[model samples]
Target chain A: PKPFVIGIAGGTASGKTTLAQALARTLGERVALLPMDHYYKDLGHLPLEERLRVNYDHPDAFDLALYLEHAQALLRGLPVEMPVYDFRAYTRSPRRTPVRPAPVVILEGILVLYPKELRDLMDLKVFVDADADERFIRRLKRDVLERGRSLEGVVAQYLEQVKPMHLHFVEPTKRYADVIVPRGGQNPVALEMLAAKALARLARMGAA
Target chain B: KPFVIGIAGGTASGKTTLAQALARTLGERVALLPMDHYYKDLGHLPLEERLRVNYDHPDAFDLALYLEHAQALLRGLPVEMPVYDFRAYTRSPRRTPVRPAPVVILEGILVLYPKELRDLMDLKVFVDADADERFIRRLKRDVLERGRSLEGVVAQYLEQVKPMHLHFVEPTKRYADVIVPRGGQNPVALEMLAAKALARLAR
Candidate 1:
């Protein structure tokens, strides 16, 4: 039987990943999460400065073909060695994560709902939403503290590339979402409702 | 400001009932666009001839007009939505003027079938009920409300309704964002949907 796939999409720091994690924790072994961030096109050939200048927010920055290929493989119940992208280096790392097929697969990313192919594969599509300023503040902290980015660099990137790209690409995809999670993972009621629905579906599929 | 909600399901699957309940729960005005009103005008054909045309088929719907009105409504434009006379099995000459509102519910058997219509919807719903129950409800409505004979209703159900639902309606469930499995009787599901609808309306 085909696994139930859920596509979670929203802007950067919009709690898409958080919501995906919450669902993963609830569903346990039956869940497999495939983050689209891991599919960023390799920038190993480019100089460090040039790689840093690239517009990472756009859809072109991600290797969608490989992402789709791996997603389809998971649906077909095939295990795949998922790539690991090194954001610090702006390229793929040498390491790969072996991901086995599960009954529920979650494709979580900023642009997961942007592609028609991806949207078609999803049984339930979700768009996580947070205030624009709230998201920017969250991203500012994360990039500086965890990713070793300077304060100036984070704000500059967000203003020049991130915010504009979110408006042009991410916000429009909200229409495609079956459920829009307001405040994202912070909304326990919505998360619980979604988990219950997913478990109910899994039970139905199991019975079948 | 309109939140378009498209409700699709098999005949007598409580799509109308759900829409009504949601609208009532919202306690506000809603623009209701029932797809039955968009049935192709059969006035050109004789009454006897029109009766034989398969109304359950997708071709029987004037989806072009339906899409046009739905688009217009989304843009805050009023449309003279057609009225279908079920007993006459054709569109009535009279039209209903539908103005835009905070929420618009498009209820039909095939609202999700057309990609164009589906694209216009913010929340797509598919109401589900037992096939036998739906058939029974449909039979009673056809015979009592529309002055259809039980024999004719049975024949139509066997010949056209059942097959059309399987081929056209059932496949469209994949496009739905929410599926109400127990139909409108599921108060919990209705409450959840009503809350979501209200949230969107506030925006």
Candidate 2:
């Protein structure tokens, strides 16, 4: 028997991180969270202005191959270290998070469920579905408060890049999801059901 | 804008028949898309190995390419859908030409789910039927039309079909805007759906 692997995917501000935290907390310390944000490709080599202009929402922004390799290694019960991405600095930090072998590993990201190969690896996959308006509102607050961006810049980037990228890439992956949690964190029933299922699978592995 | 509607159900769950009925009922307004036609070209793989994997899952489908082609079709553009040989369990060399139709109807087992693919659909429907009926229909079709052995068909259904449904297909029901119970047998619901679709198109 293998540890249960749950893939949580959704668009920006879809509460994927919140869902991941809730699942990890409820499932106890045996659960590990692998944030897809850590896989953000380093853009420090480029000019700061040029890097900021690039569409981070696109599939090209993430180092998918590296992330997949590390995820596979973790699935095999091996410890893997992931890079720490600083949104404020818009660069990778020196710090890293060490992921230990766990009974349940939650992979959460905006484009986490995009690729077919990655989708095949999950025992259960969920897509957090949020309304575009709600997502935009959440994005505005997160960018202003955490990422140190102005309301104008946030709206400009969202309208110019995030909106189109989602339509082209992220939103489409919902079809591949095994379970869809609408309203994301607002959907407690869905979260409960998903956590219950994950726990059941964990119990089965323990029994085995 | 031409809206694409995806119709998903289990094997012999009247997916094709419903597609045909919808096409006939909708006339020139609707064009059907069979998901089997989008099977990835496995010409490079050995015949035996190609047959081993359960090709019914979402992973088995070439979704990226499928999404691209579907978007083209929805935009009233032409696309060449890959031709698949069910008996050989591989895609054929020749491609089937598909022109953009006003109402693109995509029908397959795993067609309903897949965030990228389903986001393209204006309307998503799931055709529900009893498992026993689906199994019987599959048995009849495979043995009579598809040239498959009874034992092999039953084995495939038990091993590949059931588990895949539980894991992949059934979970997608929540995403469906409408679910037609008894599949095509329910003419009332079909007519209602068709009417709603027509009204939408008129808008």
Candidate 3:
């Protein structure tokens, strides 16, 4: 039987990863979560300055074909060596994670719903909706507190790339969702309902 | 301010049923619009020529007029929405009076296909069902309700509906903000939509 695939999409810091991790924890071995950020096209061949200037927020910045291939492989119940993306170096790490097949596979990212091919594979498409201020605040916290980025840099990047890319490429795809989780990961009720639905679907697929 | 909801799906894929359910759920707040009512008038054409028109194609729709009425309703203005005559393969002479509501639902096979129409929507939905189920549903509706013969409906299904669906309708699924699986049969998804509409209307 084919695995039930869920596509989670939203803007930067819109709680896509948080929701994905939550679902993964709930399903445990029955779920395999693949973050689309890890599928970013490696820019190691270029100089650091050149790589930094690349528009990472754009859809063309990711190697979606490879992402689709690995996702399709997992859906076929095959193990895949998922790439480990390095943010500091702006490239893929040589090491890879061996992702085994599961009853449910989730593809989480800002642009997961942007591609028709990827959307076609999804049994359920969800968009995480959060206010722009909330998203920017989360990004500021994560970048400065966790990722060693300066506050000014975070603000600049958010304005120059993230916000515009979100409006153009990500926000428009919200129309394609099977569900929209407002307040993102902060909405416990939505999360619980989503988890229950996913679990039920996984169980149903297993029975099939 | 009003919330505009766009519901799109393949022919007989329960777009109408889902829209009606949401309308019932939302009640006074809802103003439902079906794309079927926006089919271009064929008063200039002979009945034989009108019957030969491919109604499933995008060109067959009066999208400009649809958009006009939808925008007018959005601006708190009542509009007279046209009614279609399936037997004559043209629009009915009379129009249906619609009032401005807090929630506007525009449902059709190609509601998501037009960028202008899509842009006006606050929430977009795609009602999905199995192809076989949709085909059978279409067969029943056409023969029983639309005064169509079995052979005529089947021929139209193969010649127009099937190909047009593949080219126009299916791709629009990528444009839906929410997709109701199993069509109107999935009460959970329907409830979710109702909750969402209520929340938006409350705002």
Candidate 4:
């Protein structure tokens, strides 16, 4: 039986990770979580500054075709290896994470809904609605503390590419969602509903 | 395990458009169930009196029949969905056959008002639009679709829809699982919802 897939898409630092993790705890192992961040095309050949200059927010930044293949494989109940993207190296790690198939698979990313092929794969499409300024504040804090990004670098990327990509790509795709969750992870009502819905969805696979 | 979705909103908040879009996307995978299809019979009243009836209230709907039809659809049974003519404020002699689907969308103004009714929903959504926009949309719908006089529409708005919505529809929004701002005109939100719904239906 095909596993239920929930595609959560939003701008960077718009709380996709937090929401996905919370959903995982509630939906349990029936969920095989996949982060689109890990699928970024390798840019190890470029120097650090040049890699940082790459427009990661653009739809073309990640290798979506390969990610699509793995997602299809997982739905088929086949085990597959997922790439580990290193923030420091700004590239995909040689080390891979092996994932087992489950009843629900969450594909979360900023661009998950950008491609029709990817959007076509979701059983339910959810978009987290957040203001550009709010997400920027979040990205600033996260990059500095978690990824060791300098204030200058973060601001530069924010103005040069992040802001433009969101305007042209990320924000426009939101209308395609079946559900638009304002405030992302903070909306207790939407989260609880999703968790409850997942149980009924699981039984459809005849595992009940 | 059919996914039961309840979409509740004030009149002209684009409830029908969202439901229609979802039905189009899911196609045979879903049953397009409108709560208005279960409006209580009002043939007992005269035409003028019927036109004055407050349709925004919870009592306006035949809750029992609506719930029964929804449950029947969930149970993989076929049901003949009732039809009502807004212009006549009467039921049609004919009914549309509705087959069970993987996803069932329940949409109407008072869809999420009752506890028993709310419990049956797998997902509950509240569609939001500006109050002025809602009034304007209602004015247009009643005038165009229901053949109401502009004066009568405004009078009814002042007499029922506005006050009743304040007491009933507005409070029930707290029970919703999601809220669509600007209703179906919000292409991004609508598109995302359609895509997600298609995913679950396909699964």
Model 3, residue pairs in steric clash: A175-B176, A175-B177, A176-B176, A176-B177, A177-B177
Q: What C-alpha lDDT values do all the predictions have? A: 0.85, 0.79, 0.84, 0.83
Residues A1-208, candidate 2: write the lDDT tens digits: 6778899998999888888888888888778889987888887787778778778899899989889988888888899888899887788778898988788888899998988878878877777777799888999999999899999999899999999999999988876665556655655545655666666567677683
TM-score of 2: 0.53
TM-score of each: 0.55, 0.53, 0.55, 0.62
Tens-digit lDDT track of model 3 for A1-208: 7787889999989898998898888778889999998999977788888877888899999999889999999988889999998775667789798999888899999999999999999887888877799899999998887667788888888899999999999998987876666556655545655666666666576573
Local accuracy of candidate 4 as per-residue lDDT tens digits, B1-203? 78878888888888788788778867898887788878888888888888777787888888888888888988999899999998788988899999888888888888999888889887788887667988898898888888889998888889898999999998887777687876766665565565556555556
Best-to-worst ranking by lDDT: 1, 3, 4, 2
- True contacts reproduced, candidate 1: 0.00
RMSD of each: 15.6, 19.2, 12.7, 8.3
- Name the candidate, 1 or 3, with the larger lDDT value: 1
Tens-digit per-residue lDDT, B104-178, candidate 1:
889999999988998888777888777899999999899889999999999988988999999999888767665
* Model 2 steric clash pairs: A172-B115, A172-B116, A173-B115, A173-B116, A174-B115, A175-B113, A175-B114, A175-B115, A176-B114, A176-B115
Clashes of each: 0, 10, 5, 20
The weakest ten consecutive residues by lDDT in model 3 chain A span A184-193
Which is the winner by lDDT between candidate 2 and candidate 4? Answer: 4
Model 2 Cα lDDT, one tens digit per residue, B8-106: 888788777877788889988876778867777787989788868887777788877788888888788888888778877878788888777778888
Q: TM-score winner among the candidates?
A: 4
Off by over 4 Å in 1: B1-203
CAPRI band for model 1: incorrect
Q: Which candidate is the best by lDDT?
A: 1
Q: What is the lDDT of residue A36 in candidate 1?
A: 96
